[PDB]
Design a binder for this molecule. Structure first.
Ligand code: HEM
Ligand code: NA
Ligand SMILES: [Xe]
Length: 183
């Protein structure tokens, strides 16, 4: 994934647990050979998977719980590290935001030529609910989508309730989430 993602992980861990913990996790992840992540440079997806697993071991939290926290953090992080206007342009409510997500990644994709973004599709079931279809080239990030939806929730001052109804992990085609929302 692009370094921006790994910088964000480093930043979340450092701010919440301190630099000493961040150095232990980096060492454990097998990355001592990397002084710093380059935001606009492509890295092997392995770098990120090794960091999550090393953080899970060192911090004693399941990888899935860290991915939910990272998903909320990403909403705030991008807005403060050069992408606030891009975010604002994708809208001012949770559902309109999700409709634009493919289009937001296409814009991100101008500047990150080698991006493999997720694909998201909405089916609106009412003015207060939707089904969200998530398809990805990667495994295991559905829990990250749960935290991102909560970050967008805090962003738009909107109560959100998210329940996953289908799992790529239990053989289903792709992950589907059921979302209820409300001002
Ligand atoms: C301006 C804001 C954002 C920027 C600059 C950005 C950029 C990125 C980048 C660089 C990646 C890594 C992909 C790669 O290296 O191939 C990524 C992945 C991802 N992004 Fe976005 N992103 C933004 C906002 C969001 C938001 C708000 C969501 C909320 C759903 C989201 C959903 C995801 C997911 C689930 C992935 C995991 C990759 C996958 O599933 O295959 N992004 N994004
Ligand atoms: Na990576
Ligand atoms: Xe992300």
């Amino acid at each position: 994934m692009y370094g921006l993602v790994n910088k964000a992980i480093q930043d979340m861990i450092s701010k919440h647990h301190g630099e000493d913990t961040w150095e232990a996790i980096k060492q454990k992840a097998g990355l001592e050979d990397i002084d710093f992540f380059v935001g606009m440079e492509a890295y092997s997806d392995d770098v990120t998977y090794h960091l999550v697993g090393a953080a899970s071991e060192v911090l004693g939290k399941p990888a899935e719980e860290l991915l939910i926290a990272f998903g909320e953090y990403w909403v705030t992080y991008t807005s403060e590290e050069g992408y606030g206007e891009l975010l604002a342009s994708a809208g001012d409510s949770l559902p309109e935001f999700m409709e634009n997500l493919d289009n937001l990644h296409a814009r991100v994709g101008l500047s990150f030529p080698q991006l493999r973004p997720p694909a998201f599709e909405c089916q609106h079931t009412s003015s207060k609910s939707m089904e969200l279809h998530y398809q990805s080239t990667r495994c295991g990030l559905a829990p990250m989508v749960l935290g991102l939806l909560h970050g967008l929730g805090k962003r738009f001052q909107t109560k959100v309730e998210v329940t996953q109804t289908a799992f790529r992990e239990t053989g289903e085609d792709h992950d589907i989430f059921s979302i209820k929302y409300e001002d």
